[PDB]
């Protein structure tokens, strides 16, 4: 149904170790499709999914040039950020950017994004209106003033409503075998005695795509949030993801617990129990 495209920039200064490293990765949903790294032997935008390989040489030259220009732009941004925060040239600092668009089943824009962070803290963000900015502090307010003067938001809006959604629609069609296939979780509950009267029940979800999933334990039909150990969803390395949720239960009470699984590849949410 719904889909997203996102580009992520990371620009990291490293005084004494050359110019700041600039990396760009692009995703459609939870699928990496392009990368650029300024430390690469001959830096270029490179394909990372089969369906982007059919874009012609002109695409790759244009995309590479955008990245080459942005490595310079973001190196300048790093220097500017030092001034704005009255910082020494001694330390390593990081600017990040994430921008892109979400589209619905009909491929219309649901919303656009363009936001930056400095040293892991929000710096500036294009508002959902795609016409105004939210600056995090008085430093970012200087940037806001410059972007207001140069009508950057209008230019971002044109991109988000145009090329962003248009290119994503093309990617979704070219990659329809994978990007438009949801792989449901393979689920099971394992049982591990901790001590005489304590047992760990672990609910597994494996082999699923996209990454979004909900795993919850209930005891007598009531959610056990504060008693549930929930690991972060993690990549398998084969495009798919894994997750588990665990509860510690009194021996003999295993059947009072039920694991609940929600995923877009499942027609209805699943209920699992430990199966002796």
């Amino acid at each position: 149904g719904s889909h997203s495209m996102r580009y992520f920039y990371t620009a990291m200064s490293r005084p004494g170790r050359g110019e700041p490293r600039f990396i760009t990765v692009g995703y459609v949903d939870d699928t990496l499709f392009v990368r650029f790294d300024s430390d690469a032997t001959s830096p270029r935008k490179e394909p990372r999914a089969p369906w982007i390989e059919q874009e012609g040489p002109e695409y790759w030259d244009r995309e590479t040039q955008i990245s080459k220009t942005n490595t310079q732009t973001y190196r300048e941004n790093l220097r500017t950020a030092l001034r704005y925060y009255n910082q020494s040239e001694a330390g390593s600092h990081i600017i990040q950017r994430m921008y892109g668009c979400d589209v619905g089943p009909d491929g219309r824009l649901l919303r656009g994004y363009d936001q930056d962070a400095y040293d892991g803290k929000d710096y500036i963000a294009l508002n959902e209106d795609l016409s105004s900015w939210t600056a995090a502090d008085t430093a970012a307010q200087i940037t806001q003033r410059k972007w207001e003067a140069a009508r950057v938001a209008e230019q971002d809006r044109a991109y988000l409503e145009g090329l962003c959604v248009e290119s994503l629609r093309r990617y979704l069609e070219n990659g329809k075998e994978t990007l438009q296939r949801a792989d449901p979780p393979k689920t099971h509950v394992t049982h591990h005695p901790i001590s005489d009267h304590e047992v760990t029940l672990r609910c597994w979800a494996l082999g699923f795509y996209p990454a979004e999933i909900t795993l919850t334990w209930q005891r007598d039909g009531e959610d056990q949030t504060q008693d549930t150990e929930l690991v972060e969803t993690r990549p398998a390395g084969d495009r798919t993801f894994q997750k588990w949720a665990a509860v510690v239960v009194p021996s003999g009470e295993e059947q009072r617990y039920t694991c609940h699984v929600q995923h877009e590849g499942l027609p209805k949410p699943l209920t699992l129990r430990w199966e002796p």
Binding site: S92, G120, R234, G237
Partner: protein, 99 residues
């Protein structure tokens, strides 16, 4: 200074002794991005481990997957060793096939 990595060590497929598989170490939630990650076999560093391209989450924290092919056995112990500015000493996490 500022965010310490979470660390998960796990396999791509369910582990079955003598079956070729992939050993993964997923580091996430960290900032800044510099991180040192080794996969260990019986305490010794595995050569030529690969990793994903630096990406980050909605909260700006970074994540990376380090991975290598391996054939698990009953005796061979595997782990992931991570160092970050936030850690005074490298953190070692042992592979547990039930996690």
């Amino acid at each position: 200074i500022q965010r310490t990595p979470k660390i998960q060590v796990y396999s791509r497929h369910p582990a079955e002794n003598g079956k070729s598989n992939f050993l993964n170490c997923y580091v996430s939630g960290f900032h800044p991005s510099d991180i040192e990650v080794d996969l260990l076999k019986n305490g010794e560093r595995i050569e030529k481990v690969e990793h994903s391209d630096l990406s980050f989450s909605k909260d700006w924290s970074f994540y990376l997957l380090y991975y290598t092919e391996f054939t698990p056995t009953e005796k061979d112990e595997y782990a992931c060793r991570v160092n970050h500015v936030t850690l005074s000493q490298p953190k070692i996490v042992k592979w547990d096939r039930d996690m």
